[PDB]
Scaffold this active site. Structure first.
Site: not given
Ligand SMILES: O=c1ccn([C@@H]2O[C@H](COP(=O)(O)OP(=O)(O)O)[C@@H](O)[C@H]2O)c(=O)[nH]1
Ligand SMILES: [Cl-]
Ligand SMILES: [Hg+2]
Ligand SMILES: [Mn+2]
Ligand SMILES: [Hg+2]
Ligand SMILES: [Hg+2]
Ligand SMILES: [Hg+2]
Ligand SMILES: [Hg+2]
Length: 263
Positions: A60-61, A65, A129-131, A163, A221, A244
């Site tokens: 997801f972007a 992102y 996650d995309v980042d 957690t 999560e 990380d």
């Molecule tokens: O467009 C998006 C938004 C979120 N994330 C992933 O989902 C996590 C949690 O997103 P959330 O918006 O709940 O918190 P934030 O991104 O502001 O830290 C992000 O840190 C990324 O790891 C992603 O991959 N694409």
């Molecule tokens: Cl995902």
């Molecule tokens: Hg996904």
């Molecule tokens: Mn992330």
């Protein structure tokens, strides 16, 4: 029906020689825990290619992102399921902002602006996650009906420290005396059927929580962890699969850093 493997020449496995003596390589429910050194990728590549396996990778972007897509996709091309059929699914609110990345043969990308489709297009779904960026091999060794990934910050922690959502009023609730591992919400997958069952279960559980005026401590999560506690994954990925380095360095126990967070 699975066709026979061809003649292959590789080192004979040694029954009286542990694979790894420093880590757990199989769960109590007999699911392998994937670490470097536990698998012969040539044998696995053969098994999955003979099935003409297609892997869907979803990301997801949204908003800012979309800026992470270029590196994510470029590195996936070098390290993710190379040699196999891959279908990328990028869900975004900015279709025109998706970068034009060059893909190898047998790999395609679909942009979906923001489920039976997945059932007819891919065999396995991998959700991440995309980042992030791939830095080493991430292949068919992860494929199985349902898999979770060990959170890099809790793989050596006692369940007490996990957690998990600890409030009984939440559907994601897990008491202090329960729990196998703490899985990451950012890297899970399995067969399309199992992945849809998981997302369907979590979606419903989150709706119940919302109606009850409560939000799990770590959102999706937290629900993922409750699901995998009650439905044991058939494979568990080691922290090699989501690390990380900035925050955790490079421990000796990690022979490879395959998928990492972007600084
Ligand atoms: O467009 C998006 C938004 C979120 N994330 C992933 O989902 C996590 C949690 O997103 P959330 O918006 O709940 O918190 P934030 O991104 O502001 O830290 C992000 O840190 C990324 O790891 C992603 O991959 N694409
Ligand atoms: Cl995902
Ligand atoms: Hg996904
Ligand atoms: Mn992330
Ligand atoms: Hg081994
Ligand atoms: Hg997904
Ligand atoms: Hg769930
Ligand atoms: Hg979930």
């Amino acid at each position: 029906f699975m066709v026979s493997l061809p003649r292959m020449v590789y080192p004979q496995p040694k029954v009286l020689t542990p694979c790894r003596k420093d880590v757990l390589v199989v769960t109590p429910w007999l699911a392998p825990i994937v670490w470097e050194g536990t698998f012969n990728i040539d044998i696995l590549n053969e098994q999955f290619r003979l099935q003409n396996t297609t892997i869907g990778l979803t990301v997801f972007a949204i908003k800012k992102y979309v800026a992470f897509l270029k590196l994510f996709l470029e590195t996936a091309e070098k390290h993710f399921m190379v040699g196999h059929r891959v279908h990328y699914y990028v869900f975004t609110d900015q279709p025109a902002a998706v970068p034009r990345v060059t893909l190898g043969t047998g790999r395609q990308l679909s942009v979906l602006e923001v489920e039976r489709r997945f059932l007819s297009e891919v065999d396995y779904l991998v959700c991440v996650d995309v980042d992030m960026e791939f830095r080493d091999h991430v292949g068919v060794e992860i494929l199985t009906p349902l898999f979770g990934t060990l959170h890099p910050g809790f793989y050596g922690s006692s369940r007490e420290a996990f957690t998990y959502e600890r409030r009984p009023q939440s559907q994601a609730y897990i008491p202090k005396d329960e729990g196998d591992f703490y899985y990451l919400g950012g890297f899970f997958g399995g067969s399309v059927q199992e992945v849809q069952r998981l997302t369907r279960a979590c979606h419903q559980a989150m709706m119940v929580d919302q109606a009850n005026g409560i939000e799990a401590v770590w959102h999706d999560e937290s629900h993922l962890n409750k699901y995998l506690l009650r439905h044991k994954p058939t494979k568990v990925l080691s922290p090699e699969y989501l690390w990380d380095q900035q925050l955790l360095g490079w421990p000796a126990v990690l022979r490879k850093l395959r998928f990492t967070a972007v600084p």
